[PDB]
Write an enzyme that holds these catalytic residues in place. Structure first.
Site, PDB file in Angstrom:
ATOM      1  N   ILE A  15       5.498 -82.145 -69.126  1.00  0.00           N
ATOM      2  CA  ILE A  15       6.635 -81.383 -68.628  1.00  0.00           C
ATOM      3  C   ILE A  15       7.150 -82.010 -67.342  1.00  0.00           C
ATOM      4  O   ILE A  15       8.338 -82.320 -67.246  1.00  0.00           O
ATOM      5  CB  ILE A  15       6.219 -79.879 -68.456  1.00  0.00           C
ATOM      6  CG1 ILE A  15       5.760 -79.223 -69.808  1.00  0.00           C
ATOM      7  CG2 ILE A  15       7.289 -79.067 -67.761  1.00  0.00           C
ATOM      8  CD1 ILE A  15       6.776 -79.283 -71.032  1.00  0.00           C
ATOM      9  N   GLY A  16       6.253 -82.208 -66.381  1.00  0.00           N
ATOM     10  CA  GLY A  16       6.608 -82.791 -65.096  1.00  0.00           C
ATOM     11  C   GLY A  16       5.428 -83.207 -64.260  1.00  0.00           C
ATOM     12  O   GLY A  16       4.277 -82.919 -64.602  1.00  0.00           O
ATOM     13  N   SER A  17       5.716 -83.933 -63.173  1.00  0.00           N
ATOM     14  CA  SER A  17       4.705 -84.406 -62.247  1.00  0.00           C
ATOM     15  C   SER A  17       5.234 -84.507 -60.816  1.00  0.00           C
ATOM     16  O   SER A  17       6.442 -84.550 -60.589  1.00  0.00           O
ATOM     17  CB  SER A  17       4.115 -85.729 -62.726  1.00  0.00           C
ATOM     18  OG  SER A  17       5.101 -86.742 -62.772  1.00  0.00           O
ATOM     19  N   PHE A  20       0.761 -84.407 -56.321  1.00  0.00           N
ATOM     20  CA  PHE A  20      -0.537 -83.766 -56.491  1.00  0.00           C
ATOM     21  C   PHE A  20      -0.968 -83.552 -57.962  1.00  0.00           C
ATOM     22  O   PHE A  20      -2.109 -83.852 -58.318  1.00  0.00           O
ATOM     23  CB  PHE A  20      -0.578 -82.439 -55.723  1.00  0.00           C
ATOM     24  CG  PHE A  20      -1.888 -81.690 -55.786  1.00  0.00           C
ATOM     25  CD1 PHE A  20      -2.982 -82.100 -55.024  1.00  0.00           C
ATOM     26  CD2 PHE A  20      -2.014 -80.542 -56.563  1.00  0.00           C
ATOM     27  CE1 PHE A  20      -4.185 -81.382 -55.050  1.00  0.00           C
ATOM     28  CE2 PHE A  20      -3.218 -79.824 -56.592  1.00  0.00           C
ATOM     29  CZ  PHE A  20      -4.291 -80.245 -55.829  1.00  0.00           C
ATOM     30  N   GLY A  21      -0.081 -83.001 -58.777  1.00  0.00           N
ATOM     31  CA  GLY A  21      -0.424 -82.699 -60.157  1.00  0.00           C
ATOM     32  C   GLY A  21       0.625 -83.002 -61.195  1.00  0.00           C
ATOM     33  O   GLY A  21       1.782 -83.272 -60.875  1.00  0.00           O
ATOM     34  N   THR A  22       0.201 -82.936 -62.458  1.00  0.00           N
ATOM     35  CA  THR A  22       1.030 -83.137 -63.636  1.00  0.00           C
ATOM     36  C   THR A  22       0.873 -81.928 -64.561  1.00  0.00           C
ATOM     37  O   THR A  22      -0.254 -81.549 -64.900  1.00  0.00           O
ATOM     38  CB  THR A  22       0.677 -84.470 -64.316  1.00  0.00           C
ATOM     39  OG1 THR A  22       0.821 -85.518 -63.348  1.00  0.00           O
ATOM     40  CG2 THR A  22       1.571 -84.769 -65.519  1.00  0.00           C
ATOM     41  N   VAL A  23       2.000 -81.323 -64.952  1.00  0.00           N
ATOM     42  CA  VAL A  23       2.011 -80.171 -65.862  1.00  0.00           C
ATOM     43  C   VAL A  23       2.347 -80.626 -67.292  1.00  0.00           C
ATOM     44  O   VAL A  23       3.211 -81.489 -67.501  1.00  0.00           O
ATOM     45  CB  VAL A  23       2.872 -78.959 -65.388  1.00  0.00           C
ATOM     46  CG1 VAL A  23       2.681 -77.749 -66.306  1.00  0.00           C
ATOM     47  CG2 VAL A  23       2.497 -78.555 -63.980  1.00  0.00           C
ATOM     48  N   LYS A  35      -2.069 -77.574 -65.851  1.00  0.00           N
ATOM     49  CA  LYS A  35      -1.783 -78.347 -64.653  1.00  0.00           C
ATOM     50  C   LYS A  35      -3.008 -79.151 -64.252  1.00  0.00           C
ATOM     51  O   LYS A  35      -4.004 -78.583 -63.808  1.00  0.00           O
ATOM     52  CB  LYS A  35      -1.317 -77.467 -63.487  1.00  0.00           C
ATOM     53  CG  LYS A  35      -1.081 -78.294 -62.233  1.00  0.00           C
ATOM     54  CD  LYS A  35      -0.331 -77.542 -61.167  1.00  0.00           C
ATOM     55  CE  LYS A  35      -1.177 -76.657 -60.321  1.00  0.00           C
ATOM     56  NZ  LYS A  35      -0.424 -76.223 -59.120  1.00  0.00           N
ATOM     57  N   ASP A 128       6.140 -69.599 -50.372  1.00  0.00           N
ATOM     58  CA  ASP A 128       7.206 -70.364 -51.019  1.00  0.00           C
ATOM     59  C   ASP A 128       7.978 -69.546 -52.076  1.00  0.00           C
ATOM     60  O   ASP A 128       8.395 -70.085 -53.112  1.00  0.00           O
ATOM     61  CB  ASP A 128       6.705 -71.710 -51.591  1.00  0.00           C
ATOM     62  CG  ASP A 128       7.818 -72.746 -51.695  1.00  0.00           C
ATOM     63  OD1 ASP A 128       8.923 -72.478 -51.191  1.00  0.00           O
ATOM     64  OD2 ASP A 128       7.586 -73.812 -52.308  1.00  0.00           O
TER      65      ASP A 128
HETATM   66  C1  LIG Z   1      -0.015 -74.712 -65.309  1.00  0.00           C
HETATM   67  C2  LIG Z   1       0.106 -74.108 -63.917  1.00  0.00           C
HETATM   68  N1  LIG Z   1      -1.043 -73.891 -63.241  1.00  0.00           N
HETATM   69  C3  LIG Z   1      -1.057 -73.326 -62.009  1.00  0.00           C
HETATM   70  C4  LIG Z   1       0.132 -72.943 -61.372  1.00  0.00           C
HETATM   71  N2  LIG Z   1       0.006 -72.185 -60.182  1.00  0.00           N
HETATM   72  C5  LIG Z   1       0.763 -71.114 -59.819  1.00  0.00           C
HETATM   73  O1  LIG Z   1       1.731 -70.704 -60.450  1.00  0.00           O
HETATM   74  C6  LIG Z   1       0.357 -70.368 -58.566  1.00  0.00           C
HETATM   75  C7  LIG Z   1      -0.579 -70.932 -57.668  1.00  0.00           C
HETATM   76  C8  LIG Z   1      -1.014 -70.207 -56.547  1.00  0.00           C
HETATM   77  C9  LIG Z   1      -0.501 -68.921 -56.303  1.00  0.00           C
HETATM   78  C10 LIG Z   1       0.461 -68.365 -57.171  1.00  0.00           C
HETATM   79  C11 LIG Z   1       1.091 -67.009 -56.875  1.00  0.00           C
HETATM   80  F1  LIG Z   1       2.370 -66.961 -57.316  1.00  0.00           F
HETATM   81  F2  LIG Z   1       0.366 -66.095 -57.540  1.00  0.00           F
HETATM   82  F3  LIG Z   1       1.100 -66.680 -55.561  1.00  0.00           F
HETATM   83  C12 LIG Z   1       0.865 -69.078 -58.317  1.00  0.00           C
HETATM   84  C13 LIG Z   1       1.342 -73.200 -62.018  1.00  0.00           C
HETATM   85  C14 LIG Z   1       1.332 -73.781 -63.295  1.00  0.00           C
HETATM   86  C15 LIG Z   1       2.643 -74.074 -63.902  1.00  0.00           C
HETATM   87  C16 LIG Z   1       3.451 -75.064 -63.334  1.00  0.00           C
HETATM   88  N3  LIG Z   1       4.641 -75.320 -63.895  1.00  0.00           N
HETATM   89  C17 LIG Z   1       5.108 -74.642 -64.974  1.00  0.00           C
HETATM   90  O2  LIG Z   1       6.355 -74.924 -65.515  1.00  0.00           O
HETATM   91  C18 LIG Z   1       7.325 -75.740 -64.827  1.00  0.00           C
HETATM   92  C19 LIG Z   1       7.999 -74.858 -63.733  1.00  0.00           C
HETATM   93  C20 LIG Z   1       8.786 -73.684 -64.372  1.00  0.00           C
HETATM   94  O3  LIG Z   1       9.753 -74.235 -65.299  1.00  0.00           O
HETATM   95  C21 LIG Z   1       9.206 -75.021 -66.384  1.00  0.00           C
HETATM   96  C22 LIG Z   1       8.407 -76.241 -65.831  1.00  0.00           C
HETATM   97  C23 LIG Z   1       4.338 -73.624 -65.572  1.00  0.00           C
HETATM   98  N4  LIG Z   1       4.846 -72.831 -66.649  1.00  0.00           N
HETATM   99  C24 LIG Z   1       4.255 -71.471 -66.851  1.00  0.00           C
HETATM  100  C25 LIG Z   1       5.220 -70.597 -67.691  1.00  0.00           C
HETATM  101  O4  LIG Z   1       5.502 -71.289 -68.921  1.00  0.00           O
HETATM  102  C26 LIG Z   1       6.151 -72.569 -68.746  1.00  0.00           C
HETATM  103  C27 LIG Z   1       5.238 -73.502 -67.917  1.00  0.00           C
HETATM  104  C28 LIG Z   1       3.071 -73.354 -65.025  1.00  0.00           C
END
Ligand SMILES: Cc1ncc(NC(=O)c2cccc(C(F)(F)F)c2)cc1-c1cnc(OC2CCOCC2)c(N2CCOCC2)c1
Length: 269
Positions: A15-17, A20-23, A35, A128
């Site tokens: 999806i993206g990078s 720090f990380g790659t999703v 991620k 954020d």
């Molecule tokens: C995999 C993953 N692991 C950990 C985190 N961590 C957090 O959120 C996080 C970390 C610390 C605190 C909190 C708090 F909010 F609770 F405070 C949240 C984020 C993601 C992740 C990154 N990027 C994504 O998508 C991209 C961006 C959206 O648009 C599409 C591309 C997604 N999605 C999920 C929905 O479904 C489409 C793909 C999830």
């Protein structure tokens, strides 16, 4: 526990990078978001940054917070969340320019306030909050997340975050207080999200210089233009927005009050 054994996750489309990380989109009892850290052998600091994020996510169980599902250590350190069909609130408002009804804008506001009220009760300061970090699952349900993939010194441990200046409270721009990030700085960010909902626009659309916007907000010379709110935006909503956007952090209300005010104005429609 939450550790997922090696070989259970099917990693799919990248999806993206960031630094720090790659999703990736993946499969683990259905569609999931994965991620991964960019390095297989992390430094003590990188591993601590990873453990800090798992630490915050595992404390969350709420319909308006992105559902954390588990983490892996083998073959790589990765975080597993639910996969949501839909788009971010930013994508809806500013890219495809979706025209939601006032009733739905208030509903999105109420849902975001619930998620933020929950985080603050668990002593989690987001730091954020912005429309890019509000995902609209099936274009209906709010899922608060943090979707940045760039390296951040002490993200879930503190230091100033960048690239989200339009949502930055005056005291966060200045960095002069002993503790610049607070529940109140999250409330200011939420006030900007309300502005995005009620106007369909980013604040300060008529200033073409980003450095001037930073300077002015920090000096307290510039605030969002509330006359830009839609004609049918309730007066109680415009009042709430002004309170959330107060220049002095002490004058800002907290999420129990914010949520109670939205619940009450949503009843009157
Ligand atoms: C995999 C993953 N692991 C950990 C985190 N961590 C957090 O959120 C996080 C970390 C610390 C605190 C909190 C708090 F909010 F609770 F405070 C949240 C984020 C993601 C992740 C990154 N990027 C994504 O998508 C991209 C961006 C959206 O648009 C599409 C591309 C997604 N999605 C999920 C929905 O479904 C489409 C793909 C999830």
């Amino acid at each position: 526990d939450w550790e997922i054994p090696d070989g259970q996750i099917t990693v799919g489309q990248r999806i993206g990078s960031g630094s720090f990380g790659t999703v990736y989109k993946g499969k683990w009892h259905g569609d999931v978001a994965v991620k991964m850290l960019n390095v297989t052998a992390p430094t003590p600091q990188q591993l601590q940054a990873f453990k800090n994020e798992v630490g915050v996510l595992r404390k969350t169980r709420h319909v308006n917070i992105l559902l954390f599902m588990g983490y892996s250590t083998k073959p790589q350190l990765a975080i597993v969340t639910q996969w949501c069909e839909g788009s971010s609130l930013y994508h809806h408002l500013h890219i495809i320019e979706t025209k939601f009804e006032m009733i739905k804008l208030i509903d999105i506001a109420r849902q975001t306030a619930q998620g933020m009220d929950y985080l603050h009760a668990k002593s989690i300061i987001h730091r954020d909050l912005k429309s890019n970090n509000i995902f609209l699952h099936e274009d209906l349900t709010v899922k608060i997340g943090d979707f940045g993939l760039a390296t951040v010194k002490s993200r879930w441990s503190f230091e100033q975050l960048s690239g989200s200046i339009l949502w930055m409270a005056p005291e966060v721009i200045r960095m002069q207080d002993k503790n610049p990030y607070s529940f109140q700085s999250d409330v200011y960010a939420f006030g900007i999200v309300l502005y995005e909902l009620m106007t369909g626009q980013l604040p300060y659309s008529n200033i073409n210089n980003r450095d001037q916007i930073i300077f002015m907000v920090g000096r307290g010379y510039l605030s969002p233009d509330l006359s830009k709110v839609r004609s049918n935006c309730p007066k109680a909503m415009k009042r709430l927005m002004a309170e959330c956007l107060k220049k002095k952090r002490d004058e800002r209300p907290l999420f129990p009050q914010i949520l109670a005010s939205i619940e009450l104005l949503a009843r009157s429609l």
